[PDB]
Each structure stands twice: as C-alpha cells, then as structure tokens.
Scaffold this active site. Sequence first.
Site, mmCIF file in Angstrom:
data_model
loop_
_atom_site.group_PDB
_atom_site.id
_atom_site.type_symbol
_atom_site.label_atom_id
_atom_site.label_comp_id
_atom_site.label_asym_id
_atom_site.label_seq_id
_atom_site.Cartn_x
_atom_site.Cartn_y
_atom_site.Cartn_z
ATOM 1 N N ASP A 68 15.831 40.382 37.052
ATOM 2 C CA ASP A 68 16.984 40.702 36.232
ATOM 3 C C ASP A 68 16.795 41.954 35.370
ATOM 4 O O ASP A 68 17.789 42.612 35.049
ATOM 5 C CB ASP A 68 17.328 39.491 35.349
ATOM 6 C CG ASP A 68 17.678 38.267 36.167
ATOM 7 O OD1 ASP A 68 18.155 38.405 37.310
ATOM 8 O OD2 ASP A 68 17.474 37.156 35.677
ATOM 9 N N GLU A 120 12.368 38.297 34.816
ATOM 10 C CA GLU A 120 13.450 37.476 35.348
ATOM 11 C C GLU A 120 13.870 36.501 34.260
ATOM 12 O O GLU A 120 13.025 35.808 33.695
ATOM 13 C CB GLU A 120 13.046 36.733 36.634
ATOM 14 C CG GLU A 120 14.210 36.629 37.666
ATOM 15 C CD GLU A 120 14.998 35.359 37.652
ATOM 16 O OE1 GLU A 120 14.370 34.287 37.571
ATOM 17 O OE2 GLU A 120 16.250 35.449 37.719
ATOM 18 N N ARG A 121 15.166 36.484 33.942
ATOM 19 C CA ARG A 121 15.724 35.604 32.921
ATOM 20 C C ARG A 121 16.470 34.463 33.602
ATOM 21 O O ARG A 121 17.537 34.673 34.198
ATOM 22 C CB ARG A 121 16.662 36.349 31.978
ATOM 23 C CG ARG A 121 17.207 35.460 30.862
ATOM 24 C CD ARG A 121 18.235 36.182 29.999
ATOM 25 N NE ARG A 121 19.482 36.440 30.712
ATOM 26 C CZ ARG A 121 20.514 35.607 30.747
ATOM 27 N NH1 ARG A 121 20.505 34.471 30.066
ATOM 28 N NH2 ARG A 121 21.587 35.928 31.470
ATOM 29 N N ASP A 177 20.409 44.097 35.312
ATOM 30 C CA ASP A 177 21.117 43.617 36.481
ATOM 31 C C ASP A 177 22.592 43.452 36.117
ATOM 32 O O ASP A 177 22.967 43.452 34.940
ATOM 33 C CB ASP A 177 20.498 42.303 36.963
ATOM 34 C CG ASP A 177 20.765 42.019 38.431
ATOM 35 O OD1 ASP A 177 21.384 42.865 39.103
ATOM 36 O OD2 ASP A 177 20.354 40.935 38.909
ATOM 37 N N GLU A 181 24.935 39.686 34.089
ATOM 38 C CA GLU A 181 24.795 39.240 32.715
ATOM 39 C C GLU A 181 26.141 38.951 32.040
ATOM 40 O O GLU A 181 26.172 38.705 30.827
ATOM 41 C CB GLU A 181 23.992 40.290 31.954
ATOM 42 C CG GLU A 181 22.777 40.781 32.774
ATOM 43 C CD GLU A 181 21.762 39.690 33.161
ATOM 44 O OE1 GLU A 181 21.486 38.771 32.352
ATOM 45 O OE2 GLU A 181 21.236 39.757 34.299
#
Lengths: 282, 268
Positions: free
Chosen positions: B42, B66-67, B16, B19
Amino acid sequence: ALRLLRPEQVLKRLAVCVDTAILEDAGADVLMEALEALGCECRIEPQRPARSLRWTRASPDPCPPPEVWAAGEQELLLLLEPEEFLQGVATLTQWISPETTARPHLAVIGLDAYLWSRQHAVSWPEVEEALVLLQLWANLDVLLVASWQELSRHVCAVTKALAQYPLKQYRESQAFSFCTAAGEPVARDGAGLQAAWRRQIRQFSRVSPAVADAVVTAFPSPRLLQQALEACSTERERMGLLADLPVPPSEGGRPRRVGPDLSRRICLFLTTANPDLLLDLG
Amino acid sequence: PLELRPGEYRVLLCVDIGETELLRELQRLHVTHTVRKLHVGDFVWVAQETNPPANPGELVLDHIVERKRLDDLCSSIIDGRFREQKFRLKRCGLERRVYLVEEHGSVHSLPESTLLQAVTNTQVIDGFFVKRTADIKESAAYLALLTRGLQRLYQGHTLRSRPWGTPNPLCSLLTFSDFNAGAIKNKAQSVREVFARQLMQVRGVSGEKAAALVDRYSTPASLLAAYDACATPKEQETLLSTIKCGRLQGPALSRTLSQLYCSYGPLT
C-alpha cells in the site's frame, strides 16, 4: 523414518533465559506464572545485557536427516526503565545497543503513566520521532506496554512464534515454486477423480467451490471439455463456452453465472501451448 | 541504466489508490507525495529524477508498508488470503518490509489471543516490522515521520539501478519500472502454475513429482497430445512412469492420471 518436529515438540527445546534483576520488581512473577504454563524451559540466570531476557532454541537430543533446525539464540528482549529510555530519546535529538548475536528488542513498561507525572526533559513527539529513528537505522522496535501482563502476553507470543518457526521454514523452502494441502484418493476404477477434477478447477484464481462444481457438472472429464471446445467454430465460442452456466445466487436473489473471465481462462489453459502465458494479472 | 546524482534528486512517497480519509491528513504534515497504482503493498518511496522529458527515471527505495485495518485483517486471515498476501510482500525485492496495523474501533470478531499471535508471528517469522496505530490520522502522522527520516537517511548518497536479478543505507536499488512489473508477475497466474497445482490434487502427487511432469510436459495440451499419439491404451496407462521424479531422480501412478486425462466417459 517418521522424523517429526511439531511446534509442540520444539517448544520443549525452546528456552527463555531471564535476568535475575528482573525480579526486583515483584510484578515480574506474572511472567514466570505465565511462561511456566507454556512448556518452554525457564532459566533465571544473569544475562548478557542486564535486566533483559533472551530466547534459546537448541537441536533435539537424538539428532538425525535434514540440515537446518534453526538453532541458536535468535531473539533477545532488553527491558528498560522509562527514564533510562527517555535518556536515549534525548540522545537521538542530535544507542542503547551493544552488539550481541540475536535479534534485538526493547520494551518499556508503563511509559504513559511516567510522562504524565513528570511532564504533563522531552515529551511525546520527541519519543515518536525516536521510534522512527530506531526503526530506520537499526531495524529496532520498542514494545511500549502498560503492565507486566502485557509484557508477558508478548513474551509468550514471541515464544509460540519461535516454536512454530521450524515447521514454517521447511514448507517455505523445500516446496517447489507454485505452492503459496493433500490429494483426493482414487481407487482402481478412478472413482474419486471427479472430486479431484472439481478441485482442479478450484486451483484457478478467484474460484469459489460452487463455481468449480458448475464447470464439472457440465464437463465431467478433461477430455469431455476439450472435445466441447474443439466443436466450436469461432474463438469467441471457445472463450465463452462455460460463461452461461448457472451459479448459486449467495445471499441475494440476483442469480449468478460462471462468467466470461473464468471461461476464457479455462479455454486458454487447455488450448494453449505457451506455459508462460499469464491467465490473468490479479 | 540509471544513476541518481546526490546534488539533486527527489525522495517522495507513493500511496496506493485504495485509501478511499488519509489523503486529507497527509497533505497537512507537508509530506511530498504522489498517488499511484501499486501492485504489492500500500505504501512505497521512490527516488525521482528531478530534472530529466517530464518522465523521471525512478529508483525505488528498499521499504514497503502494507496497511491492513484490523477489521479487514480478521477477514483476510480467516479465508486463507493472509498467507498468500504476506508471501507476496516477502518476495517483492524491497526487503525492509513494514506491516502497519490500525485499530479503528473495538477489539472484540476474532479473539485477542489469536490476533496478537499472528502479528507477533509476522514480527518474528515473516520478518516484518510491526507498527500499531490507533486511527487513520496517527498512521498518517507515522508515515509523515517515516518520510522525513528517509530523506535524511539518503542525503548525499549516490544511487544506481539494479536488474530484477538481485547495516547500510541501501543504494543500488530496483527501478520503479522493474518493481511494478516484477510485482505483476509474482501474483500473475501462469498456465504452468495452475497445471502443476492441478496435478497435485491427486493422492500421491507431490512437489518434486509434479514439477517433473511439468518439466516433461509444460502445458496441458502437450500431456493430452502425448496421450493422443500413443496407440493402445496400455501405453497411455504406462506413459508417465519414466519421469525424472525427485531430487534423487511411479509405475501404477501413470495409470491413474491417464484415467483422468484419457477417459472420454465422465468421472465418478
């Protein structure tokens, strides 16, 4: 028909069945100290893999009337010695599983103390690859901890997770497809509808309740806001009707307004006849 | 309308844009990756067409990460954003879903007990795989190892293209065109979605009840216009009692919505 099953009254129906060979480490009592304080049932009895523990949720004793309580086993942690673990890491260079009924799990206590005193066969990046290989092939996590308390922290966290699970599924399913939670009380003379209409504006995305009150102060009925939109000549006046409405500045003296994006979304909410129209994307 | 042939195709990482740093670290571990806008999650992997009009038909693998960093995790849970955020991940059509948690500093903003619970709730109830990394560069090293496994897991398998209408190494995947636009309209707020949600701000209005009103009047213009056309105010007070209310299929509750939606005086 009251018929209520909270997390705190199905944790009574939760049962944790822990193998007797767990007890040959005298630090295992920390689990029993902690999971008797939680009101789940403890079973110290020999288990389907040895030196393992599994969870048990069964349906309550009068038993009504919906259909699924999610009863059965549904989780099982298999505890491993670190050298028994490091065997299977060396196996996954070029399979600690049987096949039983519940969702499988691994834990290893005290690994980074163990690899220090032996090494510092294989080392850490062999382990790190093998966790990814256990991830991808068989959806399988291994809980690397450093004490029996950390093991017991997670064992209690799994157990509170399995008590909250049947509450959450009956609002996931059996809620129609807009929810993602009560109603304002209204008398005979309306008279609580303004606080409901205030909250209806708050049901748009990205709307603070300070912004939602600024809409309703200006236009306190739905028919008072459609009448203001229809008094406009051009479509631009319709889309910017609420845009110039003052808002609390919120931690810096820079004054705020409601603004055009919400003002167009409310405009083509009440004026549109297309229910599939997207007000925004995100 | 697509096939990816096993003789050559490209297994690569999509990251994504948000970041902004991990992008420095990920190039060192020789991970074949592009940066794209992703509408849910993400991190995602696609199967590129390898030699197409410099426009690859791309199938998206059944894996999403997903982070949330742990600081912004506590933020996103305490404002109610979290349950909406996981639900979007749960309904995206990539169903081996991973939840990656970076430490990034001290643990004590929310307590230890409640943060571990919600992660283990996400592990157990929400069905996610939890990886916990300490910094930005361990998680990039994790995604390096996670990428080279997915290349080896799909070697010599033949891949085909599902519609948005829906172990084993999963072939017959969504395409990346169907994935993003499908993820667009999951989170996109429609007129019908709000008007249903607005109707249940009244005491006594429920999910089978509000979708019945929405079945009869799909847009709020049509509920107001139905109120417009009926002549005497007794009709508008009794307009709504004959809806198909429930799974089973309110007489004085048609009254109180007409008090909302026919009063040209202010409400109270």
